[PDB]
């Protein structure tokens, strides 16, 4: 009885963990796909191609999408 109720609370926090796992899942997938598409959306070898500018741009890109997905 009481033990059983403990195991319904068990599935309750299990579903809480499920929601957390799902939100991390789709957050990661959406962020990666969007950032990769955005960075590939350029010229054949990019506008610059020297890679020092693109590294910082790619960092700003994942940062913007990560912030947008988190909140």
């Amino acid at each position: 009885v009481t033990t059983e109720q403990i195991i319904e609370r068990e599935r309750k926090l299990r579903k809480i963990a499920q929601r957390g796992v799902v939100k991390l899942f789709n957050a990661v997938r959406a962020a990666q796909l969007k950032a990769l598409e955005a960075e590939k959306a350029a010229r054949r070898e990019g506008v610059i191609g020297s890679k020092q500018k693109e590294e910082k741009v790619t960092e700003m890109s994942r940062k913007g999408f990560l912030d947008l997905i988190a909140s």
Partner: protein
């Protein structure tokens, strides 16, 4: 008379120069000789592995016995080391050369290092004297051999 071999086309070529670099001339010469005549991607991955301690540059002329490991089999030389700053500045200089070639509008896929020369620089007057170096490297797209049309008789 005789004619010397003409230089490769400047718009098929790319040049890079680094002067007054603060890395040992012997180490730079050894690294340049190790990476000479290779594919661009091959050379970059080789130098990155040298930094990551994975592949060793063999010493032939300026050779001081430091390491005798299994990494020297691929060169047949029993003396091999890992010039870190050499690998790093040469990576920078081939990246500069690749950027220059991209600006000139060459095929990035087929850059090969035809030429890399390391010379000594004016000594840093401080008896302990430093040995800076000059490094100039010349790259080209792979030479292209094309079809013939069958000769017409007349």
């Amino acid at each position: 008379v005789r004619y010397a071999a003409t230089e490769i086309a400047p718009t098929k070529s790319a040049r890079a120069r680094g002067s007054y670099l603060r890395v040992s001339f012997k180490n730079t010469r050894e690294t340049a000789q190790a990476i000479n005549g290779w594919k661009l991607q091959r050379a970059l991955t080789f130098l990155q592995n040298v930094i990551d301690k994975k592949e060793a540059v063999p010493m032939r002329r300026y050779a001081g016995s430091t390491g005798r490991t299994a990494q020297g089999k691929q060169w047949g030389v029993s003396r091999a080391r890992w010039p870190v700053k050499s690998a790093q500045f040469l990576i920078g200089l081939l990246k500069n050369a690749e950027a220059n070639a991209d600006a000139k509008g060459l095929d990035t896929g087929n850059l090969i290092i035809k030429h890399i020369q390391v010379n000594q620089a004016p000594k840093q007057r401080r008896p302990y004297m430093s040995n800076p170096c000059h490094i100039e490297l010349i790259l080209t797209e792979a030479e292209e051999t094309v079809q013939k049309s069958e000769a017409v008789v007349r």
